[PDB]
Design an enzyme around this catalytic site. Sequence first.
Site, short mmCIF file in Angstrom:
data_model
loop_
_atom_site.label_atom_id
_atom_site.label_comp_id
_atom_site.label_asym_id
_atom_site.label_seq_id
_atom_site.Cartn_x
_atom_site.Cartn_y
_atom_site.Cartn_z
N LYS A 191 16.77 12.76 -83.16
CA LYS A 191 17.34 13.99 -82.62
C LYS A 191 17.29 14.07 -81.09
O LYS A 191 18.30 14.32 -80.44
CB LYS A 191 16.63 15.22 -83.20
N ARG A 224 13.79 25.22 -89.08
CA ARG A 224 12.94 24.23 -89.74
C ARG A 224 12.46 24.74 -91.10
O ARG A 224 11.86 23.99 -91.87
CB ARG A 224 11.75 23.89 -88.84
N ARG A 232 6.57 5.09 -80.43
CA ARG A 232 7.18 5.93 -79.40
C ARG A 232 6.31 6.02 -78.14
O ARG A 232 5.10 6.24 -78.22
CB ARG A 232 7.46 7.34 -79.93
N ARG A 235 2.79 11.07 -77.24
CA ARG A 235 2.65 12.42 -77.76
C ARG A 235 1.43 12.50 -78.67
O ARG A 235 1.17 11.60 -79.46
CB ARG A 235 3.91 12.85 -78.52
N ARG A 253 3.34 15.33 -90.75
CA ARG A 253 4.62 15.88 -90.30
C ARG A 253 5.77 15.52 -91.24
O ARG A 253 6.63 16.35 -91.51
CB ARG A 253 4.93 15.38 -88.89
N1 LIG Z 1 18.61 4.31 -83.68
C1 LIG Z 1 17.25 4.00 -83.39
N2 LIG Z 1 16.76 2.81 -83.73
C2 LIG Z 1 15.50 2.46 -83.49
N3 LIG Z 1 14.66 3.35 -82.88
C3 LIG Z 1 15.10 4.56 -82.51
C4 LIG Z 1 16.42 4.94 -82.77
N4 LIG Z 1 16.57 6.19 -82.30
C5 LIG Z 1 15.42 6.61 -81.78
N5 LIG Z 1 14.50 5.64 -81.89
C6 LIG Z 1 13.14 5.66 -81.48
O1 LIG Z 1 12.36 6.36 -82.51
C7 LIG Z 1 11.48 7.28 -81.77
C8 LIG Z 1 11.88 8.67 -82.09
O2 LIG Z 1 13.07 9.02 -81.43
P1 LIG Z 1 13.25 10.54 -81.04
O3 LIG Z 1 14.70 10.83 -80.74
O4 LIG Z 1 12.36 10.86 -79.85
O5 LIG Z 1 12.77 11.26 -82.35
P2 LIG Z 1 13.01 12.75 -82.80
O6 LIG Z 1 14.06 12.77 -83.90
O7 LIG Z 1 13.44 13.64 -81.67
O8 LIG Z 1 11.60 13.11 -83.43
P3 LIG Z 1 10.61 14.27 -83.03
O9 LIG Z 1 9.21 13.94 -83.51
O10 LIG Z 1 10.63 14.48 -81.54
O11 LIG Z 1 11.20 15.51 -83.78
P4 LIG Z 1 10.31 16.49 -84.60
O12 LIG Z 1 11.17 17.56 -85.23
O13 LIG Z 1 9.58 15.74 -85.68
O14 LIG Z 1 9.27 17.11 -83.60
P5 LIG Z 1 9.55 18.37 -82.70
O15 LIG Z 1 9.37 17.94 -81.27
O16 LIG Z 1 10.92 18.96 -82.90
O17 LIG Z 1 8.44 19.41 -83.12
C9 LIG Z 1 7.10 18.99 -83.01
C10 LIG Z 1 6.20 20.00 -83.60
O18 LIG Z 1 6.46 21.31 -83.00
C11 LIG Z 1 6.42 22.25 -84.13
N6 LIG Z 1 7.70 22.78 -84.32
C12 LIG Z 1 8.82 22.38 -83.71
N7 LIG Z 1 9.85 23.11 -84.12
C13 LIG Z 1 9.42 24.01 -85.01
C14 LIG Z 1 10.03 25.02 -85.77
N8 LIG Z 1 11.44 25.25 -85.66
N9 LIG Z 1 9.29 25.77 -86.61
C15 LIG Z 1 7.97 25.58 -86.74
N10 LIG Z 1 7.34 24.62 -86.03
C16 LIG Z 1 8.04 23.82 -85.16
C17 LIG Z 1 6.00 21.50 -85.30
O19 LIG Z 1 4.58 21.56 -85.40
C18 LIG Z 1 6.42 20.16 -85.03
O20 LIG Z 1 5.66 19.21 -85.76
C19 LIG Z 1 11.63 6.96 -80.36
O21 LIG Z 1 10.61 6.00 -79.99
C20 LIG Z 1 12.92 6.38 -80.24
O22 LIG Z 1 12.97 5.48 -79.11
MG LIG Z 2 12.55 15.32 -80.53
#
Ligand SMILES: Nc1ncnc2c1ncn2[C@@H]1O[C@H](COP(=O)(O)OP(=O)(O)OP(=O)(O)OP(=O)(O)OP(=O)(O)OC[C@H]2O[C@@H](n3cnc4c(N)ncnc43)[C@H](O)[C@@H]2O)[C@@H](O)[C@H]1O
Ligand SMILES: [Mg+2]
Length: 212
Positions: A13, A89, A128, A156, A167
């Site tokens: 994402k 979410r 990551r 992170r 997660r």
């Molecule tokens: N095509 C490809 N091929 C190979 N490698 C690739 C690739 N594409 C990417 N990669 C690699 O893979 C890795 C990941 O890429 P990356 O794009 O960084 O991954 P991502 O999809 O953004 O994953 P996140 O962990 O950042 O999303 P998340 O929803 O789990 O956490 P969030 O920050 O929103 O939220 C975190 C926390 O905040 C809280 N939170 C956030 N939002 C809410 C909500 N709406 N409600 C309640 N709690 C919330 C929760 O506690 C949550 O756990 C990178 O190393 C990248 O280089």
């Molecule tokens: Mg993200």
Amino acid sequence: MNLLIMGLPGAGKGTQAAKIVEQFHVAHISTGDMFRAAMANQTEMGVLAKSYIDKGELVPDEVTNGIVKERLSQDDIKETGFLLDGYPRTIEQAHALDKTLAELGIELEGIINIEVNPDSLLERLSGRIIHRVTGETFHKVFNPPVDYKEEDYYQREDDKPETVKRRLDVNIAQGEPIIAHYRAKGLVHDIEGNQDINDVFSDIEKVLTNLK
Ligand SMILES: Nc1ncnc2c1ncn2[C@@H]1O[C@H](COP(=O)(O)OP(=O)(O)OP(=O)(O)OP(=O)(O)OP(=O)(O)OC[C@H]2O[C@@H](n3cnc4c(N)ncnc43)[C@H](O)[C@@H]2O)[C@@H](O)[C@H]1O
Ligand SMILES: [Mg+2]
């Protein structure tokens, strides 16, 4: 464009969102980024959020809905559009969001659903590394930087393996009903997330250009 981008943790994402923003100038609204910013500055809500985030648990709906509603209510959103990332979410957040968007006249025009093999996600998050200033994410194997110097990167806190495993469990359980909710509305575009980063984006870019 009024957009949601969705996917399991590590589905790409943030990676794709950065590419989208670079081209379309929509407001990137990432609940993850908002929480981590608050945590870094040790604001009241940051201290609260950290409690859930460091354990890989969902931050409560009430606070989460509030910070998103606050951002959506600003005067730029109607003209520029937005990209919601990591929200909604839970189905509860989806219902709250939909009512707010209708009130503000910024109903969703499309959902970008990045589909990725869940068996790939542990390794994506384990490998990551994050550039400090930009928050640009890299991967030590799949997407490494050109010249690594340590002072510019970090990991992170919630990318520890046990937290990642928690997660994935939490978001796999909540994810399906949300996708179904928006699929019913005819808004969902499924993206082949099991490709190179640039191939995933080219697919997304085609979807977005074909909106409106
Ligand atoms: N095509 C490809 N091929 C190979 N490698 C690739 C690739 N594409 C990417 N990669 C690699 O893979 C890795 C990941 O890429 P990356 O794009 O960084 O991954 P991502 O999809 O953004 O994953 P996140 O962990 O950042 O999303 P998340 O929803 O789990 O956490 P969030 O920050 O929103 O939220 C975190 C926390 O905040 C809280 N939170 C956030 N939002 C809410 C909500 N709406 N409600 C309640 N709690 C919330 C929760 O506690 C949550 O756990 C990178 O190393 C990248 O280089
Ligand atoms: Mg993200």
